[PDB]
Design a protein around this ligand. Structure first.
Ligand SMILES: [Mg+2]
Ligand SMILES: [Mg+2]
Ligand SMILES: [Mg+2]
Ligand SMILES: [Mg+2]
Ligand SMILES: [Mg+2]
Ligand SMILES: [Mg+2]
Ligand SMILES: [Mg+2]
Ligand SMILES: [Mg+2]
Ligand SMILES: [Mg+2]
Ligand SMILES: [Mg+2]
Ligand SMILES: [Mg+2]
Ligand SMILES: [Mg+2]
Ligand SMILES: [Mg+2]
Ligand SMILES: [Mg+2]
Ligand SMILES: [Mg+2]
Ligand SMILES: [Mg+2]
Ligand SMILES: [Mg+2]
Ligand SMILES: [Mg+2]
Ligand SMILES: [Mg+2]
Ligand SMILES: [Mg+2]
Ligand SMILES: [Mg+2]
Ligand SMILES: [Mg+2]
Ligand SMILES: [Mg+2]
Ligand SMILES: [Mg+2]
Ligand SMILES: [Mg+2]
Ligand SMILES: [Mg+2]
Ligand SMILES: [Mg+2]
Ligand SMILES: [Mg+2]
Ligand SMILES: [Mg+2]
Ligand SMILES: [Mg+2]
Ligand SMILES: [Mg+2]
Ligand SMILES: [Mg+2]
Ligand SMILES: [Mg+2]
Ligand SMILES: [Mg+2]
Ligand SMILES: [Mg+2]
Ligand SMILES: [Mg+2]
Ligand SMILES: [Mg+2]
Ligand SMILES: [Mg+2]
Ligand SMILES: [Mg+2]
Ligand SMILES: [Mg+2]
Ligand SMILES: [Mg+2]
Ligand SMILES: [Mg+2]
Ligand SMILES: [Mg+2]
Ligand SMILES: [Mg+2]
Ligand SMILES: [Mg+2]
Ligand SMILES: [Mg+2]
Ligand SMILES: [Mg+2]
Ligand SMILES: [Mg+2]
Ligand SMILES: [Mg+2]
Ligand SMILES: [Mg+2]
Ligand SMILES: [Mg+2]
Ligand SMILES: [Mg+2]
Ligand SMILES: [Mg+2]
Ligand SMILES: [Mg+2]
Ligand SMILES: [Mg+2]
Ligand SMILES: [Mg+2]
Ligand SMILES: [Mg+2]
Ligand SMILES: [Mg+2]
Ligand SMILES: [Mg+2]
Ligand SMILES: [Mg+2]
Ligand SMILES: [Mg+2]
Ligand SMILES: [Mg+2]
Lengths: 71, 108
RNA sequence: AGCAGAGUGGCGCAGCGGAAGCGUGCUGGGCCCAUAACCCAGAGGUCGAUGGAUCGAAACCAUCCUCUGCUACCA
RNA sequence: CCUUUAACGAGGAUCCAUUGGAGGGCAAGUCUGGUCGCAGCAGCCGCGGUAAUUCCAGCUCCAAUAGCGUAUAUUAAAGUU
RNA sequence: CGGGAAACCAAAGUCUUUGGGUUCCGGGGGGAGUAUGGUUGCAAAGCUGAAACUUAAAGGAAUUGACGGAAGGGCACCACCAGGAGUGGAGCCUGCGGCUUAAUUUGACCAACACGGGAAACCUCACCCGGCCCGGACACGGACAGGAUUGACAGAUUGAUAGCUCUUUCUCGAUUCUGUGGGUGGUGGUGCAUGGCCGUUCUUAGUUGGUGGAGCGAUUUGUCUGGUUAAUUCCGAUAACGAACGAGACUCUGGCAUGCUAACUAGUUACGCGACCCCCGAGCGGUCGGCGUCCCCCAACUUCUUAGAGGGACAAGUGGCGUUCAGCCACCCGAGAUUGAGCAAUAACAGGUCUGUGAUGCCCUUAGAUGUCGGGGCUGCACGCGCGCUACACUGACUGGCUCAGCGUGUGCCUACCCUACGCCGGCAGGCGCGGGUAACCCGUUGAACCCCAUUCGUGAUGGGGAUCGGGGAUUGCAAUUAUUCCCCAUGAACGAGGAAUUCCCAGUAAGUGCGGGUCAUAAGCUUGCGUUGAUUAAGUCCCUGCCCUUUGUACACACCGCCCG
RNA sequence: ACACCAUGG
């Protein structure tokens, strides 16, 4: 039960990198949508959530412990 | 030394101790010899002997025997007089010797 | 240089051939609420060195060395 | 100078009362911060060693008041000449 | 009489109602009867005799305690005597000091030291070394629905599969985040700020007020000369009378009932029996008998077991000793003439506990935490000490055989585990398989050990003793290395009764001996209870250590561990 | 008919 001494590195947490909100769709024409990244074929997922464009990887943020495609 | 004195603040000993160094107008000293009336002859670790007085706080609570390291606070107006502020144990005295605090003329 | 005395436990010593202890000091216990006094146990020995006698010695004999007192005091 | 008199001359913020004290003797606070047997207080007894009614200050209160405190000489208290 | 602060005083009286005459002499405590001057003396010394300085008390009488190497009366195996077993010596276990260490967390010094249920592998856990987290209410303000904010795959990184951080960018949705106040938690500090609890003074007989009496008062009597008692228990005496607490009474427990109540979750006897077995008896072997925890009874009963109600012992009877009182000794009868514990006063201690607590004041820390995971420690070893276990053998060790207990506990809610029968397998620890028990129902008729009866050893550190160490096999667990515990072969240390000292004990007691509960996933050399075998010595005293009551002394009151002189 | 028995954070 004695006081703490000056550290060497201490730093708390990352800063939640501030990406733009939503640019996952592009139009060829109004009412003719295109999708850059594929929607994940998952049952628990409602088929409306997207995947990371992580070339050499495909990562679904919902299933945070499985379902990653390696190409 | 044993006695019926269970009264009084019973036990003021621990295996932990923390150092205290010099300040403004405050030197170390070595007890030269014992006198009466609570007085004392000392010797500042550089110069004068500077006969000392054991202050009201130390009386019969922390004993001072001859030839030990002490920390005394000098008087500004007078010179030959001072008041014993703190006592340094053997391990802490050797520690000060290691940190180069006391000119190594007196040993433990 | 000589005479006399002594050489044994850290120190003072005892020990008239069948052979290592005393007093003090040192360290730890006891006693006491505690300290001294007092009680107990422990540790520490080329018995000055070298030969000889003796069935066998620390002791007796011979040589040498080292301390102490007293005279000698000595190109 | 006083007195007699014109003309000016008050709203309380200034035309702003101080000197000592608040444990007891001895009238008046166990209110709040700071120091921690130090600094200091205290005529006397006594306060201060980390939860100070006595120290340093703020607020409040007590005493006498244009006065009040201190050192000394002396008188009463002293039926202690 | 009266006086006085009182002790005391017919004088120390006739004193604020103060005046019979007269000589000497004092003015807080020291410095000091000192320095100096004078005078006397042979000398030693006598007489007269200051001051500077210093200090808040010195002192008197009486009271209440504590103390006494003071006296009187009593008392206790935490006292002795007479003894027993010992402890101190040896090896090991465990606690405390010291040393060492990153840390070896810490409290406590008769009334600490096998104590904190403290037998710590993780946890516990407070210590040391690293790493995540918020589980920071609430108020206000700030940013914020192209949006506050959450969580995470892969490579690097890390003890780590902690999105901890870094590269990359999906996902969640107002629950957050930033800042200022304010809370919160703490096995953080202070037990000398406290509550409560406990320990101890203190196991003895001690304590207190109301009205009355004595004193100016603190105080005192009641609460006692004497006898008696384990006892301030009684008898009595009596300026006291009438009361309260503690003691006693009280509760549990051990000893006795052939009397009562009544029992297949307890038994006995009887025979209904039936059956096995042996002649072991007359006899034939059958009938009669003998053994049976072999099987039955809608047999009869409660002796043994259970547990309820009552009974029973009161110094009641008899003899002595007692002021013929309170009571004491002995004896008959008897299950017994003196079982053992629980509870316990006024006043107090700077006793222990903030580490039992959602008991608690104040101080400290509060996100780089003093609020969680991984690893190490609490166990380290020149040494000093305490409580204990096993031994030093023949009143023994070993190997077989025989034969007897009692107090208990037992399936768990969160928490996941209980006690075991019997069959098989294995030398052993242990494994597999099937049943009973929430219990007078099953383990269990609890086949306990010492003891008893026979073998081998033979005075030799021996076949006594079992430390230390090598190699192997099991079980609990997430994990056994610094060996958790258990089993097997081997190695085979000190120790031949213990110096000065010192502890506990009076009858089913000391000591020997094993068994349960507590802690317990694993596990007792500890403690708390139970039985079993079962002595020697006493019926006393105040010597030693202390305690209680009276008288006495005191320069003590922080109370003899006091005070105090040079 | 009487050995020794000092001191106190
Ligand atoms: Mg004039
Ligand atoms: Mg003022
Ligand atoms: Mg003032
Ligand atoms: Mg003030
Ligand atoms: Mg005043
Ligand atoms: Mg007043
Ligand atoms: Mg303050
Ligand atoms: Mg204050
Ligand atoms: Mg005057
Ligand atoms: Mg007269
Ligand atoms: Mg007259
Ligand atoms: Mg005077
Ligand atoms: Mg005179
Ligand atoms: Mg003269
Ligand atoms: Mg004073
Ligand atoms: Mg007196
Ligand atoms: Mg008295
Ligand atoms: Mg007496
Ligand atoms: Mg007796
Ligand atoms: Mg005896
Ligand atoms: Mg023994
Ligand atoms: Mg063990
Ligand atoms: Mg330790
Ligand atoms: Mg006692
Ligand atoms: Mg263990
Ligand atoms: Mg641990
Ligand atoms: Mg708090
Ligand atoms: Mg707490
Ligand atoms: Mg206390
Ligand atoms: Mg207390
Ligand atoms: Mg009265
Ligand atoms: Mg009266
Ligand atoms: Mg009385
Ligand atoms: Mg009696
Ligand atoms: Mg009576
Ligand atoms: Mg009465
Ligand atoms: Mg009679
Ligand atoms: Mg009879
Ligand atoms: Mg009884
Ligand atoms: Mg009591
Ligand atoms: Mg407590
Ligand atoms: Mg607290
Ligand atoms: Mg604890
Ligand atoms: Mg936790
Ligand atoms: Mg841990
Ligand atoms: Mg420990
Ligand atoms: Mg003990
Ligand atoms: Mg035995
Ligand atoms: Mg047991
Ligand atoms: Mg068990
Ligand atoms: Mg057990
Ligand atoms: Mg224990
Ligand atoms: Mg004793
Ligand atoms: Mg008595
Ligand atoms: Mg008296
Ligand atoms: Mg006094
Ligand atoms: Mg004394
Ligand atoms: Mg002196
Ligand atoms: Mg003494
Ligand atoms: Mg002395
Ligand atoms: Mg002295
Ligand atoms: Mg003293």
């Amino acid at each position: 039960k004695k006081s703490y001494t000056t550290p060497k590195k201490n730093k708390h947490k990352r800063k939640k990198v501030k990406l733009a909100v939503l640019k996952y769709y592009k139009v060829d024409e109004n009412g003719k949508i295109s999708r850059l990244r594929r929607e994940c074929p998952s049952d628990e997922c409602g088929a409306g959530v997207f995947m990371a464009s992580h070339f050499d990887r495909h990562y679904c943020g919902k299933c945070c412990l499985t379902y990653c495609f390696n190409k | 030394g044993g006695k019926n004195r269970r009264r009084g603040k019973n036990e003021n000993e621990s295996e932990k101790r923390e150092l205290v160094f010099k300040e403004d107008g405050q030197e170390y000293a070595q007890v030269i010899k014992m006198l009466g009336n609570g007085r004392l002859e000392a010797m500042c670790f550089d110069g004068v002997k500077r006969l000392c007085h054991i202050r009201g706080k130390l009386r019969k609570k922390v004993w001072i025997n001859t030839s030990d390291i002490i920390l005394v606070g000098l008087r500004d107006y007078q010179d030959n007089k001072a008041d014993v502020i703190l006592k340094y144990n053997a391990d802490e005295a050797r520690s000060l010797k290691a940190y180069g605090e006391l000119p190594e003329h007196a040993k433990i």
